[model samples]
Target chain A: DAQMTNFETRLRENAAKTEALLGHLLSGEARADEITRPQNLLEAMRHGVLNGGKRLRPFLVIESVALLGGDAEAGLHVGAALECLHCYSLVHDDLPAMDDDDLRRGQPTVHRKFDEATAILAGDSLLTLAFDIIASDDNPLAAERKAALVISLARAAGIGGMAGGQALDLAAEKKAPDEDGIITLQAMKTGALLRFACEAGAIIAGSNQAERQRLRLFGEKIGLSFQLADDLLDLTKGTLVALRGEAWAREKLQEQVAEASELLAPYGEKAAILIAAARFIAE
Target chain B: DAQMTNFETRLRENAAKTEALLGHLLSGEARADEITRPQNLLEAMRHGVLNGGKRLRPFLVIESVALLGGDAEAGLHVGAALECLHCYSLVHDDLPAMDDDDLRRGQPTVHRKFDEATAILAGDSLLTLAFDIIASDDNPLAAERKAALVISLARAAGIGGMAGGQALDLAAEKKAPDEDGIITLQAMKTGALLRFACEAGAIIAGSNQAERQRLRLFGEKIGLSFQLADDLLDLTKGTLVALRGEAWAREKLQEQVAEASELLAPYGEKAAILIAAARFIAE
Candidate 1:
């Protein structure tokens, strides 16, 4: 219970710091001599990375690290790296070639915020920058930790996880996948990082192997539940509302949320806040 | 002669290990449940990352480390990180909004390999995994080296380097780049990673400041030359042939190669192989 209270407080603080760090890193006011520029790319990158968000990934990282008794400073860098990567994905996702969405977090998506080309490059830049931040010796995290973090993030975001999921999702479009297929797809696309988040935090915190393993499983379950919730929401017509109709979607969402809460029950005390968060989001 | 022999043997051995390491790390088949069962994303990713390419980026890292006198075992893990990052770039480059290329290295591009949306997500996963690899504690590369390598690679691949160059290159499609602009663009786009390759080797090998700095410069010049030679080949309408013909292209490439060779003259024997390698590719 005390941990939950502390976690809540830390979450709030980390969220603000995460945004501030992103704001600082994404800023690209043009310099005079380097005038041969893609202003659109710069602007889109800035917009996608700096736009207001809850910094949930970073917060989760910090909290998970602290729970593992690791230094939060290193986690902070990891958090920033994660945020950059997340923002990059969002930018690319919103491109005309992908989701073709015009809005994100209630503002113009990167492609809409700039041009499609700029948005693409902006996503590229942010993605690269995330690695830069983690890999930089200037960062406070341990070198080995940095290496592992980089590798972990890449795997989670790459072909086998985020990108692969996106590809499959697209291919399945207009052709409905079985419930099993959909679950599998969303887990890879959405849950991989969530699971990684738990693993990463544990790794940074120096959690023992057993602890890390437990967290990994915890993350996997949570990630799946999260994906189900997201999918159900799509059916209900909120963020993913554009993809489907409202009434059928709402019923599916309710079913998914119940499943999600059941999955969270195993974490016992640790599951409480996360469950609350999930419920809040679903609602 | 002894040193040269040793270097050559070790280079070959390291290259093999690097390749194997990449095959293992990027191999998504082992974790199909993590990859595909719940997330169709994983399945799509396995097809793209696990199935193709020579893993040249990882090879570069391992070779560089071996040459620099670092432990090959450690270098292999570090190299895996590089491969993840490179794969991410390739995935992104293939996206409908970027090069829109449907095939890469003769296979369907990640998007076409699966779908546009999945390709984007796969790229995202790769990018994150690159960072995560570094963050893993099991990684043998020293913390400092890992961080430095990750940072160097990230910067090389990201803005002001590969991504920035890409933007410039795309812009140049409809218009001609003056020689200076072309060189700058290519240096950023192609040369950045080559420089990173040499520098990564030095970083892993634990070279002294002067040695590391020298390799970095060498990488930049050689990378430029490498691209120049490729451009020349394009002008010649030979080899893998990705260039559009222009009268100035061959001339310009010749000038670059000549200048690059001159730059290498100072390194004596070390530059010889690189020079030959550069020329061989170009010819």
Candidate 2:
């Protein structure tokens, strides 16, 4: 319980710090060669991005590096980059053509706050900004690592990754999926970025391949943080949670925790933040 | 007419080559560490991407590279990357929430052939692919240069660039623009990527800043080839063309050609391709 208490404390403070960097990155001031930042577009971008949220994914990216005793500042910038991608997911998914949710949590989605076109453009710019941040000279990592980040981040965000999951999720709404499809759907949508967040720790560290894989597996496990099918609270013909969550089920959840918990054992206490991150999802 | 005849000749063959490379890149085969790619989503991506265009932007990218005697293969790859981004722009803008066009020229748009959700996802995945292509280990440029490409491409595509133009265009639908606003609006939308295409030549060439700026200026002038706003074929209180296109006018277009024609002089006959490109837009 004491550890749990401190986990959230660090989460909150770090979120504040991580978001601070994001504010500057997302500000009106142009980078060299940037002609002009349209005030309205910049505003909509901020609206989608700065709204209060858990900041869980960015924290994972930043903290993973620190756990490995890597460059702290570089980790922060990379963490902010993940947050940019995360918000892009939220913004695009909320478009009238996609999930069509006008309100996220309670606030208006980007499309609702602005208009559909502005929302689409803002969603797009956010993604470019994310890649730009990782690839730019501003990020402290060497060019070799920056190139690696761009490639990996592209894979994580591109087809067969988060966007792939999104496409499947769209398919499911029109046609039901099997157990495996649902598993993949959930993993692609939720887990891809989560996996990247943890894996990025090793990447930013410039650590060995085995270290990268270890963090990758760790990230994949946390990506299993799907407790609900989301549509299940209202609807899902495919989700285990839908079949399993009308009332409930816990075995897979507990099973994942144990496996994830076991893998980090070799890393000892330094892996505490990630360990708690695994559990925090269940909480 | 002599140059114009062969201009389309080189243009058509290069388009074929660029499309060949693009088709291979966009295939169902996965890249390293890639997970599953949804069949339907991939189908929609090809629908929007492989559909016929002059591949003019790509030709500019590849030709600009070769203009400086840079690596032709790398130029081709970078050229293919620009086509990916170009299609992304078209696919997204065609979504029901944006331009909502059911057809691009004649064929069904990604959204029309597929649906809105699939189109949105496809549009998104395409963008990630563009960045991935440039930043990937496969791009062949040095990592430092790859980093520059990613950063420059991001800025070109992000806010105050293409997306910013999109936002302004959206704003214009609700409120008419003045002369200056229309100039800013069109340039942001049409000119940014053109600028990137020519400028990328210098970047890939690892050429000097002065050369980069010269190509950049040439690109910008060529970007002024905005003969008509499709929306203005029907409607604008703004745009020199809109006020002028319901009937028509050509001074600015000619002016642009002459200036762009003049700028490339120092490069001798080597600048002939770009000179033809600027002229090709009017013909």
Candidate 3:
């Protein structure tokens, strides 16, 4: 119970910090060039990105970075960048041509609040803005680290990752996917960013390849558990959890959590929060 | 006349190179990661990017880098990246919720050929892939240069730039824009990327501040000419050219060309192709 409270406290703090950074970076005043920022589009982007969420992905980024002794400020910015990309995906996914959702986090979706075109452009700008935030001169990360983050984030968020997964998910809705197919789709659609969050922390810390790989694997395990828990909570009849039954799903989630904890063993007490994070995924 | 012919030939060659690079980068085999590549999304991306346009933006990037004596190979990759972003914009712009076009370069648009959701995911992926291409280890640009390119490209492609412009363009359709409002929209919508193409070349070449500014200005001038020429060709009643009249538009185009040529005057004969590029924009 105390660990959950601690995680919730840390998440709230990080979310607040990330929101401040996002506001500053996304503000028209931050960019002096006249042709760069459009007011309405900026308003739409801010509306989508600044919307309150749990900031779980950003939490992973910060926690991973802190575990490896990286700069907290740099991690926060990177976390903000990831959140922008995440939020943009939500905006686009909520478009009429896509999921057509009218509400997100109890607010009108971008396309609902604004026009469809504005929502699409807002999502587009937000996605690009993520890279801008990462690669901007104001970011204090080393050039090499910034480049690594860009490549990793792009791969995770791009076609081969989140976008690709979304396509598969869309296709799956037309015809239900098999168990393995659903797993692959779930891994891609939602798991890629979570994986990137952990890998990015290692990258920011300049950790060795072995350690980076460990964190990545840990992230992947928890990512799987997170999806299963989500499906279970949603009570989706076609989801893997429903198909396999809750007992099997819970056992699998526990297995993943145990493996994730094992992967973080090398870091010992420094990885306590991360291990707790894995447990939270199962919970 | 011979010099103009030479420029055309060079442009064609550069376009071909950019296409090959895009094909390779978008291919599933290019990445060994299992979850990274989705076949349908890749097909959609290829459909959008390889629709066989003039590749004018890639030409600008390649030529600008050449003028500054940067690595042609690196320029090709960056040019490909720019083209990817360009293609992604076209894909999204053609969506049913946006421009609602059914054809591009005489072929069915991505949304028409595939589906709306697929088109959206493909565009999203292509935009992310552009950054992946720019930041990939295989890209020969230095870390700092890659960072600079990412920052510059993001600003050009993001909300403040092209995306913002689209939002403005959509809003303008609902209400007629005044002269300054129209210019602002055109500049943000299309001019931003053109400016980035040239400035990107300068950045890739590691050009000094003054030179970068000069190329950027040269780009902005030609970018204006490009929009005017497009308006003239489309005969779109609401366009600036339609509002300004053909005679005045022609004069403005010539003025921009002359200024672009003047900006390249310092580069001497080394800028022959660039000067010719200005002529091509007006033509």
Top-scoring candidate (TM-score): 3
Best by the lDDT measure: 3
Give me the displacement of residue A70 in model 3, in angstroms.
Answer: 0.7
Candidate 2 residue lDDT tens string, A1-283: 7778767988997799888998899889878756678999999889988763789888888888988878888888888888988898899888777777978878988888888888888889999899888887878999888888888888988897899999988889889998888888887888888888888889999989998998899888787754342343345357777666644535666667677778788889987877887777654
- For residues A206-258, could you state the per-residue lDDT of candidate 1 as single tens digits? 66778777667756755655654566655541123344445655665566556
Considering summed lDDT, which 10 consecutive residues are worst modelled in model 1 chain A? A29-38
Q: Write the per-residue lDDT of candidate 3 for residues B91-181, one digit (tens) a residue.
A: 9999888999999988999999999888888899889989998998988999999999998898788777888888888888888889888
Estimate TM-scores for all models: 0.75, 0.93, 0.97
TM-score for chain B of all predictions: 0.77, 0.93, 0.96
**Candidate 2 C-alpha error for residue B235, in Å:** 11
State in Å the error of residue B95, model 3: 1.3
The per-model lDDT (C-alpha) reads 0.66, 0.83, 0.87
Clashes of each: 64, 1, 2
